Amino acid sequence: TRDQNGTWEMESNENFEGWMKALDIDFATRKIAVRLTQTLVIDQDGDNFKVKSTSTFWNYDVDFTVGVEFDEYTKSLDNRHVKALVTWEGDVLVCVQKGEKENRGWKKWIEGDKLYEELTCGDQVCRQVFKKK
Numbered sequence: 328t329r330d331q332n333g334t335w336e337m338e339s340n341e342n343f344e345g346w347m348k349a350l351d352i353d354f355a356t357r358k359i360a361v362r363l364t365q366t367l368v369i370d371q372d373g374d375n376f377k378v379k380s381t382s383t384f385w386n387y388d389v390d391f392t393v394g395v396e397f398d399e400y401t402k403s404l405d406n407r408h409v410k411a412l413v414t415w416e417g418d419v420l421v422c423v424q425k426g427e428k429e430n431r432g433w434k435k436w437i438e439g440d441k442l443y444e445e446l447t448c449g450d451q452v453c454r455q456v457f458k459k460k
């Protein structure tokens with residue numbers, strides 16, 4: 328299923344700090360952020376997505392249309408400019424962010440009643456699982 332609509336509450340988080348390090352997030356921010364439970368809110372209508380990543384420490388929103396390249400500033404994450412593109416590979420939603428960092432992007436897919444997410448940058452992969460609330 329390609330339907331990722333919903334409010335998703337984090338169940339597990341692996342190597343989040345490795346991913347943040349590959350983005351050069353500073354020590355203070357990483358040490359706090361790695362402790363925290365996350366929420367993902369996804370509003371999906373056809374190709375149009377609105378995605379929100381939230382915790383008690385950050386609130387990060389992005390809107391995109393599947394298949395349409397967009398220039399993006401990554402704002403409070405790491406303050407960089409990328410060219411971003413989100414597409415479908417089967418039922419895996421795949422984002423590639425072209426720029427300074429290699430292998431930068433994410434993937435999301437549904438496995439049952441849960442949302443699986445990969446965050447990638449450099450040689451680091453962070454793996455997360457969310458439950459539908």
Ligand SMILES: *C/C=C(\C)c1ccc(-c2ccc(N(C)C)cc2)cc1
Binds near residue numbers: 380
């Ligand atoms: C599908 C997942 C997306 C678009 C996403 C974007 C950004 C983040 C994110 C933002 C900010 C931070 N900080 C400040 C540590 C971490 C991760 C997560 C997911």
